[model samples]
Target chain A: AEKQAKRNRREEILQSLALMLESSDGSQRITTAKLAASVGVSEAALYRHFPSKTRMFDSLIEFIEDSLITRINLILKDEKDTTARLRLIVLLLLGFGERNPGLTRILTGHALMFEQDRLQGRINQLFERIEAQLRQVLREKRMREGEGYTTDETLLASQILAFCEGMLSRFVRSEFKYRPTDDFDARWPLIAAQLQ
Target chain B: RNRREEILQSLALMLESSDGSQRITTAKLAASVGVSEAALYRHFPSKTRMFDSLIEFIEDSLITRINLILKDEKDTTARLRLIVLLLLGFGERNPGLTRILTGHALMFEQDRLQGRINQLFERIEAQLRQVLREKRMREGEGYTTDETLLASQILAFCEGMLSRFVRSEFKYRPTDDFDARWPLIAAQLQ
Candidate 1:
């Protein structure tokens, strides 16, 4: 029971940090003491749960990577084909942003501002992984669809991922006003048409 | 000679060239121009005001060119392509302003810069929305769910390119793969 309770406390601390990020104004930095105070714990208690604030941010990044890739793999289970996999993966990014506005800010670099350099690199890695997934799907499409592809498949994958990153960035910059999945039903087909 | 403009110009230079990711200090800014901190404030009230001046310069420069694009360009496809090209090209030309736009430098120094940066994009997105609206009317495609989403997507993609440019510290040109990419962007309208 102590182990489970300790895990829950760490989880709670991370949740508090994420909530604090949503209203951070992108101006003042969030200190560990302030974060601990907000979570109704002493600074020592905060340290007991996590070694440092960087560790706390790492937990959140881990959560983001786990949750997103888990759902993406599930999407692949149902869709199987190249285009659907690509579209669903892109759609999943936008959908994830809409669902997790605070995390969206983190992914967009707003929350990561003034943080450690490693945090920024981690975010970049996340996008690189997403782009890699896109490259594989595009390669499959090229093999199946034959020779109409004008741009290099790798370049096309990067461009598609760029659009998704841009969509999330805009959503964050808009202060959660712009929904990443706002016009999915009507607009995405045309936008996704640009993938080729 | 314009003292205020000189200070603003110096500030942009420091931001673009500095290796450290620290906020611009008034003292450092003044020393570079051979002025005391107070003298620096004589032209601008605060460091934030100097930043405001830089933001205004970018707004006026881009908005003026965008207005010209709207008036001079006729074909919808050409207009869309040109506007995207213009943004990426402008980033290439102005590495200092590109730093500001991408939140790479001076972002945490002043809260006001973020708001101004956001407004600049909103203005650009608004412009694209209108151009797209006109094209939709001409073709009667009626495929896009709405004007705002489609336009925002394009602007977001542009911002992504800008973001990448800044992350690479101006090493990655915004138009690196644009020749092959514009056609893909152009096809979205149809």
Candidate 2:
């Protein structure tokens, strides 16, 4: 029971941190003392749960990785149509950012500024992995659809990933007013038309 | 006249030399220019103004070239390619300014610097939309998709490439595989 309670406290702390991130206008740096106060815990208690502010961000990023990567794998396994898989993957990425406004800041590196530089590196790697999956999906499509698929899979995947990142950056830069998935349906066709 | 230009040049040089891990300081900028801190303030009122001047230069340079492209080029597809290449090529030639264009260098500065950068991109996207709209009017048939969305996607693609260049610490150039990639990008327009 004690261990379970401790786990709950840890989860609560991270949740509060994300909320604080979402609320800020990106002008100020988020400090540990402020985070602890927001969580209704003492500074000592906050540290007891996580060693440092950076570790708390690490936990948040880890959650992002686990959540997105797990869903991506599931989508790949369940969806057989290459086109559908590509659409779903892109939708999944945009939707995830849409739902988590605070985490969106982290993903865009706006929240990571003035923090540990390595945190930005982690976010970079996350995008690289996502792009790699995109490449794999495009590669599969090219093999199945041979001569008709004249577009280079590597270039196409990079274009798709870049478009997605651009949307996320706009979302953060606009201070969350612009939805990452806004007008996505209208835009996808223009992108899909290129695949021919 | 020449002193102000010298200060801006030194600042850009410092931005180019550093790995972007260190923040640019007025003290260091003065040292780089071989001037006293007081002397630096005379040429420019504040550090923010110095950055603003740099941004103005970027704006003047790019907007002038864009106008020249519009006047010189008649082919719609060629116009788009040239504009995109102009953006990517500018970043490639000026690694220091690439940092500013990507907003990595503006992280610690006044917030308005970023806001200006945002406006710069908005203007670029607007120009792109104008180009597509003209194409649709001239071609009239089969160009039915919304030009706004297409323009936005193209802008996004460019922004994404630039972001990757900065995040990779310049390991990946924005125009790394232009020959192969431009065709894929151009096909989207058709």
Candidate 3:
């Protein structure tokens, strides 16, 4: 029971940290004192849950990676149509940002600013992995569609990933007022036309 | 101040020198310029002001070239391509300014510096929209999508390229695979 309670407290701390991030305008740094107060715990208690503030952020990033990658794999497995897989993956990414505005800030590096530099690298790695998955999807499309598909999968994948990243940045820069998936239905056609 | 330009250059050089790991400090800038912190403050009031000056340089350099591109290029498609290429190429050549453009260098500074970059991109997007609107006026058919949406998409593409360049520590050039990618991007514009 003690171990289970400890796990619950750690989750509560992470949740409070994310809530603080969701509430901010990305202009201020999130300090331990503020995080502790939000969680209704002493700073030492917060420290007991996570060794340092960076660890807390790492946990959030880890959640982001696990959540998105797990969903992406499910999409790839369930959806056989290559193009549909691509669209679903894009929507999944944008939807993730829409659902988690605070994590969007972290994914876009706004929250990582003034924190450890390696955190930003971890964010970069996450995107790179996503981009690689996108390229694999495009490569599959090429093999199946033969002469009808002439687009360079690698370049197209990068272009697609760039568009997604750009949209997320816009979402963050717009102070979360703009949804990453806003007008995505209309925009996807324009993006999909290039896939031909 | 005559020393002002020298100081800004030193700052840019330092920004380019690092691999996006080290933060720039006024004391370090003073040391690079072989001057005291007092001397550094004599010209630029604060480190933020020095960054502002660098931002101003980037604005002038980019906008000046953009004007030239507009004046010289008659084809609207060519104009769009040139502008995007100019943005990517500028970052490719000016590595330090790329840091500023991507807001990596300004991370520790005042929040307003990042705001300035946000405005700069807004202006660039507006430029793209204007170009597309003019093209629509000249050639009306087959222009199905909103000019505003198309322009934003293009601008986002440029921003993504720069973001990648910065994240890769400048190893991946913004203009990499441009020749191959242009057709893919152009297909979407129409």
Candidate 4:
């Protein structure tokens, strides 16, 4: 019970950071003292939970990675149509961005601006993994259609992933003013039809 | 005229050489060009004005050449291919401008600066939409490819390339996968 309570405290700290990120215009730096005070914890208390500010941001990164992968896994299991899977995956990415404006800053590297290089690398790998998963879905699609011999899964997958990343870039650059899902139903058919 | 233009050139070179982490300050600008701060100010009003001039130069240079692309290219699909190629190529060739275009170099400098950069993108998207609309007139819009969506996707892909270029500290080549990925988009043109 004590460990669970500590874990909950740790999450509360991350949640506060994410909130601060969304509230700012993506230019305000979050000092550790600032973060702790915002979370209603003493500086030392915050440090006890997270040894450093970098660890705090890393915790956020890990949280983002886990949440996305869990959702992606769910999509893979529940969605059977290949193109629908592809379209749904894109929707999932945009949907995540819509709900978490603060995390969108991290995903787009706007918040990671002056942070450690490793954090940026972690996010890069996250997108790469998304691309790889997309390729897997597209590969299955081609094989099932019996045109696996001619299809270039890598090309299509990378293009789709780029479109997704581009959407996220606009979302954060516009300071969350641009919704990733804007006209998505009308726009996606034009996007997905190409791949099909 | 000559010294003023020379100052802007030096600024571009300075921005190009940055690690994407360096801030553009007037002191650094004056020192790079072997001029005093007073001399630098003689040619420009403020650091913001200098940036404004640079953006103007970029806008004029790109828009003029793209107009040439529009006039010379007869095929609608080919027009888009060249336009996307030109945007990505421009970023690849000019890292300093890429910094400005991606808004990394503008970080915390001036809020309006980022808004201007966004306007630049909107202008490009408008050009792309015009091109795609012509394609629709010729061959009819494909069920999956509306002119506006196609234009935005094309713009997004270019922006994504720029984002990767900046985030990777210029290590990611924007043109590395162009030949492989171009058809994935062009297939929708019909």
Interface RMSD of each: 2.1, 1.9, 1.8, 2.3
- Best to worst by DockQ, what's the order? 1, 2, 3, 4
Model 4: per-residue Cα lDDT over B139-166, one tens digit each: 7654345677668777888888888887
What is the DockQ for all candidates, taken in turn? 0.56, 0.52, 0.52, 0.45
| Model 4 residue pairs with clashes | A190-B144
- Point to the candidate with the largest TM-score: 3
Cα lDDT tens digits for candidate 1, A1-196: 8999998888888788888777655345779878888888889878898888878788888888888778777876787577788878888899988887777767876576667767867878887888887787777775766643557887788788778777777777666777878777666677667766
Give the poorly placed runs of model 1, Cα more than 4 Å off.
Answer: A24-27, A144-148, B1-3, B18-21, B27-35, B103-106, B136-145
Q: Tell me what fraction of the real C-alpha contacts between chains A and B each candidate also makes.
A: 0.51, 0.42, 0.39, 0.36
For residue B165, model 1's alpha carbon misses the true position, in angstroms, by 2.0
Model 4, docking class: acceptable
Cα RMSD of all models vs. native, in order, equals 2.6, 2.4, 1.9, 3.1
> What tens-digit string does per-residue lDDT give for candidate 1 at B34-59?
78898886887777877787888889
lDDT of 4 by residue, A88-141 (tens): 889989999888889888888877765676788899899888889988988887
Evaluated at residue B8, the lDDT of candidate 1 is: 84
Better of 3 and 4 by TM-score: 3
- Compared with the true structure, what per-residue lDDT tens digits does model 2 show for residues A79-135? 888888989899988999999988888887767766788998999899889989988
Report the Cα lDDT for candidate 4.
0.80
In candidate 2, position A172 carries an lDDT of: 72
lDDT tens digits by residue: candidate 2, B1-190: 7999999888878766644535688888888889898999897887989889888888887788988898899778889999999888888777777677777677768889978988888888887888887875667754546887678788787877777776666777888888777877876885
Which is better, 1 or 3, measured by TM-score? 3
Q: Looking at candidate 3, what is the lDDT of residue A116?
A: 86
Among all candidates shown, the one with the greatest DockQ? 1
